[PDB]
Amino acid sequence: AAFDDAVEERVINEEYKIWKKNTPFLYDLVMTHALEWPSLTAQWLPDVTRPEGKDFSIHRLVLGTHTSDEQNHLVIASVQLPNYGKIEIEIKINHEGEVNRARYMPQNPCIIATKTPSSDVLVFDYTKHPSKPDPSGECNPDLRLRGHQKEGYGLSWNPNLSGHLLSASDDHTICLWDISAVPKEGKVVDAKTIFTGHTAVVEDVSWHLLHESLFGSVADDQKLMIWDTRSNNTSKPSHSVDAHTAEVNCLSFNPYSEFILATGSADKTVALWDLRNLKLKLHSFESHKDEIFQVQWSPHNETILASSGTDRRLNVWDLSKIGEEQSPEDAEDGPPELLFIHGGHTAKISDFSWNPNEPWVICSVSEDNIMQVWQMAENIYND
């Protein structure tokens, strides 16, 4: 008498019908693609090819596989975008276990770090591997980063210190590696520093974008922690905030507002934070119906951020609309700061990435192996 509620599902399919029927009015772009396997991870590479006098540009994504066999890959996919275009797998690299998360290094986007079900973080240089995977089934990472006892998801490259990499784990710790001086030839590298302030699964970690010594972490202990690598005490952060009424799954620093960040939580809210006074939450974004797992600021607009999670929705928020007036009927669809609800996915969303070269384009991937590349209608973000 327990699977009957899981058989709705019927509600999902009905809402999907309605959504597809309305995409002409809500979107300027909708591309849907069933991947061979679900990807737990998605990140646009920063580069973009705009071929000679053609009406499209070529973009690329770091993706992964999630299969229960022994043929998992780190994937690089290409995406033709116009200036309701195809999607091609360019490279597959043998990967040990499913790819929990894959992130390119800002100072050299050929370098990809991945999180694996074994506690290791693997580093690949995808230019050093063939386009077709090794039929031996063997995984040959360019670096093997040691230090965790359990898998995790949080992964962050320092954008101001080349090769300084943070990782968050279910073992309650945060590992910092510095691979800057290490030749990427398959060596094992031990963690330079291990931060132990959290008392529960650490869900996410993220470097500040301007201050090279500052980073933040969020964990199942409901805390946001702000760390400073200049501190000698690796068991106690600079700041600790009781951030949510449940697990905190993600955080993201505003790339235009150096004091501002956001966290997403199993309490179904996105919280807004000001580093200058972390005692006081600036705002709580409240319309997700289930646990939030990913939050990301717009790369192009300082007031714009997006959140996704297990309610299969991707919410786009506009903090400049906080406090706005709305007609009582318009006030039913949600708060004024809720700019858009993406309802294209029919399963839990695992990751999404704002395209850094085409404003308002987003790639989101879900558990049913669907990948969507989409852009809300221009009239929605111009009112």
Partner: peptide, 5 residues
């Protein structure tokens, strides 16, 4: 804590 599948 995330659960896969």
């Amino acid at each position: 804590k995330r659960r896969k599948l």
